[PDB]
Amino acid sequence: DYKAFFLSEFPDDKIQANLQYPIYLGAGSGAWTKTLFKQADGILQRRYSRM
RNA sequence: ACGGAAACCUUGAUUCUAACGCUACUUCUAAAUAAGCGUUA
């Protein structure tokens, strides 16, 4: 779902391949790895619209 | 110069012996130190 939602808009050479079950841990992985991105779409971006 | 005089309601005695302010009870329950990089060049 994350690849069909976010990672598909970027060049394939910038996206890594999975050897085992994927996960995103810690800082720097992005907002969509830490939210319910299906429901946070729209709300998250408008939270930063005036910055 | 009195039915009056003399005469301790007195001596010895522990309000004492025994007895747990005790029995049971999680300072516990969810929670990434994480998000945003625009515009100009």
**Entry resolution (Å):** 2.7
Q: CB of A32 within 8 A of CB of A2?
A: yes
A46 CA → B10 C1’, Å: 110
> C-alpha A21: how far from its chain's center?
17
Which residues, other chains included, contact A34 with Cβ-Cβ below 8 Å and sequence gap of 6+? A24
Task: State the structure-solving technique.
Answer: cryo-EM
A16 CA → B39 C1’, Å: 30
| Closest-lying nucleotide for A31 based on CA to C1' | B35
Task: Kindly list the protein residues whose beta carbon lies within 7 Å of any strand B atom.
Answer: A 24-31, 33-34, 44, 48, 51
According to the 3-state scheme, what is the secondary structure of chain A? CHHHHCHHHCCHHHCCCCCCCCCCCCCCCCCCCCCCHHHHCCHHHHHCCCC
Tokens of A9: 């808009």
- In angstroms, how far apart are the furthest CA atoms of chain A? 40
A14 CA → B7 C1’, Å: 132
